[PDB]
């Protein structure tokens, strides 16, 4: 099966580096771009960067040119990441990824803790949490600051992250399920509102939810919707 494998926690000194790596299988590496992602609780997910293994070509995300490196060694299947320069700003998850729909494949992401003890487009996010009755409806919208459409089509996704697992895709385009998501889920919306609806909400659906635009460079995400179940 195709995995990106990622180390769980580095914890590193302010002003050090860091390299982490995103080891692949299953696949071939030469072919497919891979891409870099930051969380943090606040800020949800930002696109740090991409590379195309196969020729080591990378773009970056303006906000990210100083801080990241993006590297691949094809003789190990391996993607690299160095941030450096570390702050306190830095401390987050940061995944590898395929990012779009249809080669959707998500590393569990690399914590890395900093510690001393001493025009893009935005999309926003309504609720951003939210906690649902078994068998409730949830209702989550996202709001883009410009359109996300061309040709008819919305280039616009719904990632989903269950609590202690990697983000996956669970809607793309707007509107389709991705395979193997349950029927309950569906998505609505175009231009610049989207609308995902759960009905009816069972156990397995807490998690977080993020939207995501990839019409225009950087791809840009919401900051995340955390659903709960409201326990009765
Ligand atoms: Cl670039
Ligand atoms: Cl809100
Ligand atoms: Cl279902
Ligand atoms: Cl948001
Ligand atoms: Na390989
Ligand atoms: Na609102």
């Known amino acids: 099966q195709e995995q990106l494998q990622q180390p769980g926690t580095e914890l590193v000194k302010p002003g050090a580096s860091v390299r982490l790596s995103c080891k692949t299988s299953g696949y071939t590496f030469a072919s497919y771009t891979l891409h870099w992602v930051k969380q943090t609780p606040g800020q949800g997910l930002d696109w740090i960067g991409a590379i195309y293994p196969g020729n080591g070509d990378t773009s970056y995300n303006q906000k990210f040119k100083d801080k990241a490196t993006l590297t691949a060694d094809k003789s190990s299947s391996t993607a690299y990441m160095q941030l450096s320069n570390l702050t306190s700003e830095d401390s987050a998850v940061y995944y590898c990824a395929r990012l779009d729909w249809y080669f959707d494949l998500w590393g569990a992401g690399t914590t890395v803790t900093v510690s001393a003890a001493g025009s893009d487009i935005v999309l926003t996010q309504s609720p951003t949490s939210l906690a649902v009755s078994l068998g409730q409806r949830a209702t989550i919208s996202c709001k883009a600051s410009?359109?996300?459409?061309?040709?008819?089509?919305?280039?616009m996704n719904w990632y989903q992250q269950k609590p202690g697992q990697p983000p996956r895709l669970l809607i793309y385009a707007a509107s389709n399920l991705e395979s193997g998501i349950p029927a309950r889920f569906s998505g609505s919306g175009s231009g610049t509102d989207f609308t995902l609806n759960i009905h009816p909400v069972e156990e397995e659906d807490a998690a977080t939810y993020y939207c995501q635009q990839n019409n225009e460079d950087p791809r840009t995400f919401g900051g995340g919707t955390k659903l709960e179940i409201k326990l009765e």
């Open positions: 410009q359109s996300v459409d061309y040709d008819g089509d919305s280039y």
